């Protein structure tokens, strides 16, 4: 009865709860709490309402969100797998179920869910998440469709600020928006670049628009003093847009992209004359408000340009910068790392959702064919590790040859690579920041460059480093090269010594050179839009 009132408030938080004071009510109150970040409670409420209606998908989905946001991953799963049974044709639910299964390495009916979602993307319905879709075996064409759809909806609900232009007066003001400034891939990849730019391109005024508070990391601090860092974490999308506009940013970069907060509306409001997509979301934004994408000759080749909605820009070398100031400490012994003191250590520290059936089979094939080797993986959420040991076994490999490392603070995690002999990349979503973490350490990465940007990032690093032999043609060749390198320790040792040379000889880790190319690109870009210099 009085219920319909409560709902509308979502679009007054406490005025709503006031209404819910009166079931599909236990559920609504539960949803109120979930809005109030009080996840623990919201899960208790929805858990109740779900027992009172174990066949009401509206409630099962809502309970799932709460359980997830309350850190109860495994249980949250069953919640979505249930909201799926009770409403098999709703793609929105299928999309979410699929994404959570991947993260847990639950591959039951994987191909069928994947098909439904890709199909949903093609019908333009289902509102599937672009970042989540990167884990699917979809082509660059499918990805573009997925992105546009999300972009066009956002574009519809927003009225752009008053139009402006690049100054033509200079200094040029370049802005960067991210939720990752410090102890997150984004900050980790750009610190050395910003420090280099501050020192080598004083003419270029760097502005960082952080949508996350200070986390106490050295990275956040370094970024803060290597640019003008604005903490706009508390502003809404409009205020944030007006704030960037208030600073007269000429070239604005989206370092959040789809997924990871991102604040998509902030960019839709077009607060800056020129907006660039770079280094955050490894795909096309497919958005009307995004002018350019910054890739490179390898990861974003001509044959791929058609799928990018924005105009393609390329840097001379690889598109990805890196923190070249990181000292790689010594890890604990192999034993203290749960690793056999003898034998070849093959590793893949990628996020669990990048660990699909195909990639896992690939890695296991190497173990099965090379005795005494082990697979060092990054421990996943829920019971992912358990499912993986199981799969390994079902694949003919002693499940005990898989060693799982817990997520560690960057410095400590970085040091673990010294025990690695070869990094095995995943497909179709490569290791990106993880790929360069390994290379920086001196650990070679083996990859199978695909046909989508996200499936060619590790390849771009290898290419630009000079290690083209590590960019093989397919799974068969992938297993071959691994087994070859694994079987002959003289070769492995030779490959490590070779990476160490190319590392120092190649531009890939020369941030001073990157700062110049990048700066040169920013000025040319500005001049193309009216800037005259000074």
Taking CB under 6 A as the rule, does residue 413 contact ligand UDP?
yes
**Which member of 311, 407, 488, 528 binds ligand UDP (CB under 6 A)?**
407
The tokens 């630009």 sit on which residue?
A: 464
Distance separating the N- and C-terminal Cα atoms of the chain: 66
Element (H, E) at 292: strand 292-296
- DSSP E strand boundaries for 266-380: 274-277, 292-296, 311-315, 345-348, 374-378
Region of 466 (left: φ > 0; alpha: ψ -120 to 50; beta: rest) is left
Taking CB under 6 A as the rule, does residue 220 contact ligand UDP?
no
Q: Quote the CA–CA distance of 6 and 385 in Å, as a whole number.
A: 42
Q: How many other CB atoms are there within 10 angstroms of residue 126's CB atom?
A: 22
Shortest Å, Cβ 328 to ligand UDP: 12
**x-or-dash pattern for ligand UDP, window 321-350, by CB under 6 A?**
----------------------------x-
**Which member of 32, 188, 210, 315 binds ligand UDP (CB under 6 A)?**
188
CB 10 within 8 A of CB 17: no
Q: Of 332, 225, 311, which Cα lies nearest the Cα of 528?
A: 311
> With respect to ligand UDP, which residue has the nearer C-beta, 58 or 259?
259
Q: Quote the CA–CA distance of 471 and 352 in Å, as a whole number.
A: 22
> With respect to ligand UDP, which residue has the nearer C-beta, 43 or 192?
192
Taking CB under 6 A as the rule, does residue 408 contact ligand UDP?
yes
Stretch that binds ligand UDP, among 26-34, 308-316, 330-338, 404-412 (CB under 6 A): 404-412
- Residues 6+ positions from 65 with CB-CB distance below 8 Å: 34, 76
Shortest Å, Cβ 257 to ligand UDP: 12
**Which member of 185, 264, 286, 519 binds ligand UDP (CB under 6 A)?**
185
Subset of 221-250 contacting ligand UDP (CB under 6 A): none
Say if residue 127 is preceded by a cis peptide, omega within 30 of 0. Answer: no
> With respect to ligand UDP, which residue has the nearer C-beta, 354 or 401?
354
Q: Quote the CA–CA distance of 214 and 220 in Å, as a whole number.
A: 7
What are the residue ranges of helices labelled H in 21-90?
26-35, 39-51, 57-68, 73-85
Shortest Å, Cβ 378 to ligand UDP: 6
> With respect to ligand UDP, which residue has the nearer C-beta, 43 or 279?
279
Subset of 434-453 contacting ligand UDP (CB under 6 A): 434, 437
Backbone angles phi, psi at 115, to 5 degrees: -60, -45
Taking CB under 6 A as the rule, does residue 410 contact ligand UDP?
yes
> With respect to ligand UDP, which residue has the nearer C-beta, 195 or 437?
437
Taking CB under 6 A as the rule, does residue 187 contact ligand UDP?
no
Backbone angles phi, psi at 311, to 5 degrees: -70, 130
What are the residue ranges of helices labelled H in 373-453?
384-394, 410-416, 433-441
Taking CB under 6 A as the rule, does residue 117 contact ligand UDP?
no
Stretch that binds ligand UDP, among 1-9, 23-31, 427-435, 516-524 (CB under 6 A): 427-435
Stretch that binds ligand UDP, among 24-32, 214-222, 431-439, 441-449 (CB under 6 A): 431-439
With CB under 6 A, what is the number of residues at the site for ligand UDP?
Answer: 14
The tokens 């409001």 sit on which residue?
A: 269
The tokens 């409403």 sit on which residue?
A: 87
**Which member of 351, 395, 487, 523 binds ligand UDP (CB under 6 A)?**
351
What are the residue ranges of helices labelled H in 274-383?
357-369
**x-or-dash pattern for ligand UDP, window 60-79, by CB under 6 A?**
--------------------
Shortest Å, Cβ 131 to ligand UDP: 10
Q: Of 302, 242, 294, 304, which Cα lies nearest the Cα of 269?
A: 242
Backbone angles phi, psi at 456, to 5 degrees: -130, 10
Element (H, E) at 178: strand 172-178
CB 330 within 8 A of CB 359: no
Taking CB under 6 A as the rule, does residue 168 contact ligand UDP?
no
**Which member of 228, 233, 433, 523 binds ligand UDP (CB under 6 A)?**
433
For ligand UDP, the nearest residue by Cβ is: 433
Taking CB under 6 A as the rule, does residue 459 contact ligand UDP?
no
CB 309 within 8 A of CB 148: yes
Shortest Å, Cβ 430 to ligand UDP: 8
Element (H, E) at 24: none
User: Which residues of the chain form contacts with ligand UDP (CB under 6 A)?
Assistant: 185, 188, 349, 351, 378, 407-408, 410, 413, 431-434, 437
């Amino acid at each position: 009865a009085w219920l319909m009132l409560a709902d509308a408030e979502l679009g007054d938080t406490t005025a709503g709860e006031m209404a819910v004071q009166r079931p599909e009510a236990v559920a609504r109150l539960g949803r109120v709490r979930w809005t109030q970040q009080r996840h623990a409670e919201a899960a208790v409420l929805l858990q109740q309402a779900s027992d009172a209606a174990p066949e009401h998908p509206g409630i099962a989905l809502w309970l799932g969100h709460a359980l997830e946001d309350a850190g109860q991953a495994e249980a949250a799963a069953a919640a979505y797998t249930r909201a799926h049974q009770l409403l098999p044709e709703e793609p929105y639910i299928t999309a979410q179920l699929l994404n959570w299964r991947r993260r847990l390495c639950d591959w039951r009916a994987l191909d069928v869910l994947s098909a439904q979602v890709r199909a949903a993307v093609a019908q333009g319905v289902g509102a599937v998440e672009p970042f989540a879709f990167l884990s699917e075996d979809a082509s660059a064409a499918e990805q573009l469709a997925c992105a546009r759809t999300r972009a066009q909806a956002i574009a519809a609900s927003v009225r752009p600020l008053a139009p402006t232009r690049v100054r033509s007066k200079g200094p040029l003001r370049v802005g960067f928006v991210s939720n990752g400034f410090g102890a997150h891939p984004t900050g980790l990849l750009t610190v050395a670049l910003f420090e280099a730019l501050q020192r080598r391109q004083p003419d270029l005024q760097m502005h960082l628009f952080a949508t996350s508070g200070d986390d106490g990391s050295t990275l956040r601090t370094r970024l803060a003093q290597a640019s003008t860092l604005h903490d706009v974490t508390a502003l809404g999308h409009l205020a944030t847009a007006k704030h960037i506009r208030h600073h007269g940013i000429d070239l604005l970069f989206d370092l959040a992209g789809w997924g990871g907060g991102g604040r998509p509306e902030v960019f839709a409001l077009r607060p800056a004359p020129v907006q660039v997509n770079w280094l955050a979301y490894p795909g096309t934004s497919g958005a009307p408000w995004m002018d350019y994408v910054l890739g490179d000759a390898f990861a974003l080749p001509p044959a791929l340009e058609p799928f990018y909605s924005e105009h393609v820009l390329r840097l001379q070398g690889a598109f990805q910068p890196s923190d070249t100031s990181r000292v790689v400490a010594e890890p604990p012994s192999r034993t203290q790392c749960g690793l056999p003191e003898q034998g070849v250590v093959l590793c893949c520290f990628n996020n669990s959702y990048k660990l699909n059936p195909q990639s896992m089979a690939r890695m296991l094939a190497v173990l099965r064919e090379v005795p005494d080797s082990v697979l060092w993986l990054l421990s996943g959420p829920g019971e992912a590790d358990a499912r993986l040991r199981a799969f390994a076994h079902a694949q003919g490999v002693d499940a005990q040859r898989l060693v799982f490392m817990p997520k560690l603070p960057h410095p400590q995690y970085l040091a673990r690579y010294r025990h690695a002999d070869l990094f095995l990349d995943t497909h179709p979503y490569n290791a990106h920041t993880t790929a360069s973490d390994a290379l920086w350490t001196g650990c070679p990465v083996l990859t199978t460059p695909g046909e989508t940007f996200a499936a060619r990032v590790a390849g771009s690093l290898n290419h630009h480093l000079g290690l083209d032999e590590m960019n093989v043609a397919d799974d068969a060749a992938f297993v071959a090269k691994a087994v070859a390198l694994a079987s002959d320790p003289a070769a492995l040792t030779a490959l490590h010594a070779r990476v160490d040379v190319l590392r120092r000889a190649s531009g890939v880790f020369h941030m001073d050179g990157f700062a110049d190319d990048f700066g040169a690109l920013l000025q040319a870009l500005a001049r193309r839009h009216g800037w005259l210099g000074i």
